[PDB]
Amino acid sequence: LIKEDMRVKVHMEGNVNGHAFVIEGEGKGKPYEGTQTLNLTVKEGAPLPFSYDILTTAL
Amino acid sequence: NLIKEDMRVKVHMEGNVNGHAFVIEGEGKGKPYEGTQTLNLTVKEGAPLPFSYDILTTAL
Amino acid sequence: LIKEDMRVKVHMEGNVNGHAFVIEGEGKGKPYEGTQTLNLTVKEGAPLPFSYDILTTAL
Amino acid sequence: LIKEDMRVKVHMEGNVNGHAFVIEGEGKGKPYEGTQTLNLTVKEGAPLPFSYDILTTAL
Amino acid sequence: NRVFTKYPEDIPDYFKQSFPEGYSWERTMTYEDKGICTIRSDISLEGDCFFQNVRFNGMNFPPNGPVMQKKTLKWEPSTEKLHVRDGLLVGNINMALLLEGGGHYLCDFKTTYKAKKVVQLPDYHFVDHRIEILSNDSDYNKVKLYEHGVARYSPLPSQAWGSH
Amino acid sequence: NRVFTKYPEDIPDYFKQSFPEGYSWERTMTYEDKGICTIRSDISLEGDCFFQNVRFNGMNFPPNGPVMQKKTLKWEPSTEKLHVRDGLLVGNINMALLLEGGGHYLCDFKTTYKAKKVVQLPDYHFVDHRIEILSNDSDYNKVKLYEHGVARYSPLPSQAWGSHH
Amino acid sequence: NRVFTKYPEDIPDYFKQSFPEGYSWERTMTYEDKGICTIRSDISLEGDCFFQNVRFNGMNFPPNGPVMQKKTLKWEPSTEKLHVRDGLLVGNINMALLLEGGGHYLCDFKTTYKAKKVVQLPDYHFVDHRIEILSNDSDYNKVKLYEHGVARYSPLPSQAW
Amino acid sequence: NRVFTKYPEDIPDYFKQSFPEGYSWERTMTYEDKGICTIRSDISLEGDCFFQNVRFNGMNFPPNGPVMQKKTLKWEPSTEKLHVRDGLLVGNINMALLLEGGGHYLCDFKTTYKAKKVVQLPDYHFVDHRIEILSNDSDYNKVKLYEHGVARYSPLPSQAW
Ligand SMILES: [Mg+2]
Ligand SMILES: [Mg+2]
Ligand SMILES: [Mg+2]
Ligand SMILES: [Mg+2]
Ligand SMILES: [Mg+2]
Ligand SMILES: [Mg+2]
Ligand SMILES: [Mg+2]
Structure with a gap:
């Protein structure tokens, strides 16, 4: 059912020590x-008061 | 002293416990x-809850 | 059996952070x-090079 | 200084759950x-009433 | 909402001081099978009815455990430890669920309170609490929830006097 | 997305198996300085494009820390340990953020992966990962993300052989 | 040693009941920079005089940390949670050591008291503690130590109906 | 003994570089039912002998647990996270112990290795281990212990630019 390429879309609602944000992602993968x-892209909430690194494994 | 020997309380809770999502709502009084x-x-949604209510009450 | 006035004797062998210490004590209460x-009293390894409070709840 | 064949010897005093024990070993590798x-060899405390695995990355 | 706590004269009241502006707070509940809940809530006042807005997330409870099996009876009462750290107010608690027939499923509570105004700051102090469901279905789609909390110091006077 | 992980025939692949329905996972991230995040994400497949809805709730990071002070660098490569527990796959990791200047900032990561379908279940195994930011704008309103992840057993052969417990 | 705690008549007194046989105990201290300590104690009664027999072990206290740097002023008084786990009375506590020059340094406390005689088990209850250094030479070779204790229920009414 | 860990020439072997003088280390082990072990070890070369010297201390493993009921079969291999701190190689690991039939029982692991001499420090990297009882009497009085350790980097391309 799944192959050498696949598309990625991502919607994250999140919150960190107060700040609310929304992030939307597009991409592909092997x-x-x-x-x-x-x-x-950061829809709601930009600019982030906190290290973007904490987010990346969730994206 | 804006805050009175008697007061009222409104409470909106949204939440989600091991997947199971829910919206809880209540009104009340305190001293x-x-x-x-x-x-x-009252649980407006997700009723009936699959989880011990107790984990919610100190937040509610 | 236990009474209003009673004595206490204390023996603690211990090591903190690899530093050794034997310490003893005599006391009373109600x-x-x-x-x-x-x-x-610190028996061996005096002086203790760490906050005496970590010990006290033991002693 | 360190060579393809070296030798090992190991000494371990121990307490686990009140229960004391000593253990000695001698060995080798590359x-x-x-x-x-x-x-x-468990030199003292035997037989050990607790799993031995929880001692081994120490041994 | 710690606004509802009995707070002695000699003990700043972080919560009733924060008004009219009020405050928010943030809570991690650490249960012993590493199910966790994280919570945050904003408490507002206008007139005579405070408003709590609250979000609640719990994950990693074992399916075959006392929450997922609904075998908890209630919380015990408790005492929270409140201390200022990084200009803020924190509270710490050893929490107990009483388990059906006997036993306890325990929890650490850590809460960080954040007033939207500069309030006077209290010293290390405690809060005696007691929380109780009073009326409920078996399904708890309706619930009636009581808490009583009272603030203090230790009732044990010091014998320390003079030192360096 | 652990769908995007390489899995030899040796090991069952919990994630590509789960589909067509797909899966859900829950993660707690518990930092060396006492911050915390819980995260939930649903992963579905509609067509050729995986949709990932996520809810990230981070909390309790001290205000003058390397997260709130916006001064971390990247994640280090990593290796996840993964066992079955209550018939779920659970993912355990020791994570490390490099800190601007020299030092590290640290994080246990525990995940419960949950496939919305019965699949063939693996034994204990590892995944080795590497996640990287490849580009961004000034305030990371725009970011470009690269993970890599590959599943194995131990390389160190077993030399025990024959025994009774 | 509990036994040095005031019990009210309507709380059973796990520790005292335990004599003449005595009781032992075992506690874990987990600090907030992850220094850690293990401890065990036989508490026996020879006549008027209790003998405490202890072994104490701790680790990972970062050299620059306040334990090794001696920057504690004291422990904060506290309030132990007492429950029965599988026959035994388990106490839990949130301790904080008042820092040098303001601030607090925290520690988690779990204690199990294993009586060695049939005693009448209690229900959930608390003990207000205050432990205090009351005198100490400079290097602390000679230290005098005090501790109060009071058994407790909630002083708050159960509105249960 | 991280000495017996094959280092590819790309990585500095912190271990074999610490000799002749030696190296000591310090570890804590937290089990998921919070039994807990603290341990220390000194590693002295003489002639060709590494005489390991060790103090080991284990705490509050629960009665009906695997440890006290002896239902471990082994440790799973593991992968240690190695990362220079305050000049000190600190290692981190999610260990697990296979059980009779029933799956696993987990454990966290922090090790710091301290050099007796100035050596060259590595960048962040991992040591795959596997540790194993080759043989034992029914009592474990005599136990043959083997270990395999191999330091690596990441097998994966930082495909970044
Ligand atoms: Mg003394
Ligand atoms: Mg101290
Ligand atoms: Mg022993
Ligand atoms: Mg344990
Ligand atoms: Mg030893
Ligand atoms: Mg032990
Ligand atoms: Mg194993």
Whole structure:
């Protein structure tokens, strides 16, 4: 059912020590090779008062 | 002293416990300086809850 | 059996942070009034190079 | 200084759950070839009433 | 909402001081099978009815455990420890669920309180609490919830006097 | 998305198996300085495009820390340990944020992955990962993200052989 | 040693009841920079005089941390949660050591008291503690130590009906 | 003994570089039912002997647990996280112990290795281990212990630019 390429869309509502935000992502990945890439835009809440690193594993 | 020997309380809760999402709502009264209050709570959604209610009450 | 006035003897062998110490103590109190006093001495490894408070709830 | 064959000896005093024990071992392996072998004797405290695995990355 | 707590004269009241502006707070509940809940709530006043807005997330409860199995009876009463850290007010609690027939499923509560105004700051102090469901269905779609909390110091006077 | 993980025939793949229905996972992230995040995400497949709805709720980070002070660097590569528990797959990791200047900032990561379908279940295994920001704007309103993840057993062969417990 | 705690008549007194056989105990202290301590104690009664016999072990106290740097002024008084777990009385406590120059340094406390005789088990209750250094030479070789205790129920009414 | 850990020439082997003088280390082990172990070890080269010297201390494993009921079979291999701190290689690990039939029982692991001499420090990296009882009497009085350890980097391309 799934192949050498696949598309990615992402919607994250989140919140960190007060600040609410929304992030939307588009990208693709190689499921069978174990990789992917994602362009990430901050809809609501920009600019982030906190390290973006905490987010990345959720995206 | 804006805050009175008797007061009222409104409460909106949204939440989600091991997936199961829910919206809880209540209204009530308290006595600020006596350290007392009593709340009426209704589950507007997700009823009936699959989880011990108890984990919610100190947040409610 | 236990009475208003009772004595206490304390023996603690211990190591903190690899630093050794033996410490002993003699004290008294009132089981029903909930008080107790204790006279404590460092037997070996004095001086302790760490806050004596971490010990005190033990002693 | 360290060579393809070296030798090992190991001494362990222990308390686990009140219960005391001593344990000694002597052994061997290949440091550059990152493998190690060891022979263990429980010199005191035997038989050990708790799993031995929880001692082994220490031994 | 700690606005409802009995607070002695000699103990600043972070919560009733924060008004009319009020405050928010943030809570991690650590239960012993590492099910966690994280909570945040905003408490407002206008007139005579405060308003709590609250979000509640719980995850990693075992399906075969006392929350997922609904075998908790209630909380015990408790005592919270409140201290200022990084200009804020924190509270710490050893929490107990009484388990059906006997036993306890325990929880750490850590709460961080954040007033939207600069209020006078209290010293290390405690809060005796007691929370109780009073009326409920078996399904608890209706519930009636009582808490009583009272603030203090330790009732044990010091014998310390003079030191360096 | 652990769908995007390489999985040899040796090991069942919990994530590509789950689909067509797909899966859900829950993660807690518990930091070296006492911050915390819980996260939930639903992963579905409609067509060729995985949709990932997520709810991130981070909390309790001290205000002068490397997160709130906006001064971390990246994640380190990592290796997840993964066992079955209550018939779910659980993911455990020791994570490390490099800190601007030299030091680290640290994080346990525990995940419960839950497939909306019965699938063939794996034994204990690892995933080795690496997540990286490849580009961004000034305030990271725009970011470009690269993870890589590959599943294995231990490389160190077993030399035990024959025994009774 | 509990036994040095005031019990009210309507709380049973786990510790005292325990004599003449005595009781032992075992506690975990988990600090907030993850320094840690393990401890065990036999508490026996020879006549008027209780003998405490202890072993104490702790670790990972960061050299620059306030334990090794000696920057504690004291423990904060506290309030232990007492419950029965599988026959035993388990106490839990949130301790904080008042820092040098303002601030607090926290520690988690779990204690199990294993009586060695049939006693009458209690229901959930608390003990207000205050422990105090009352005198100490400079290097602390000689230290005098005090502790109060009071058994407790809630002083708050159960509105249960 | 991280000595017996094969280092590829890309990584500095913090371990074999610490000799002749040696290296000591310090670890804590937290089990998921919060039994807890603190341990210390000194590693002295003489001739060709590494005489390991060890103090080990274990705490509040529960009665009906796996440890006290002896239902472990082994540790799973593991992968140690190695990361220079305050000049000190700190290692971190999610260990787990396979049980008779029933799956796993988990444990956290913090180790710091301290050099007796100035050595060259590595960048962040991992040591795959596997540790194993090759043999034992029924009592474990005599136990043959093996270990395999291999330091690596990440097998994966930082495909970044
Ligand atoms: Mg002394
Ligand atoms: Mg101290
Ligand atoms: Mg022993
Ligand atoms: Mg334990
Ligand atoms: Mg030893
Ligand atoms: Mg032990
Ligand atoms: Mg194993």
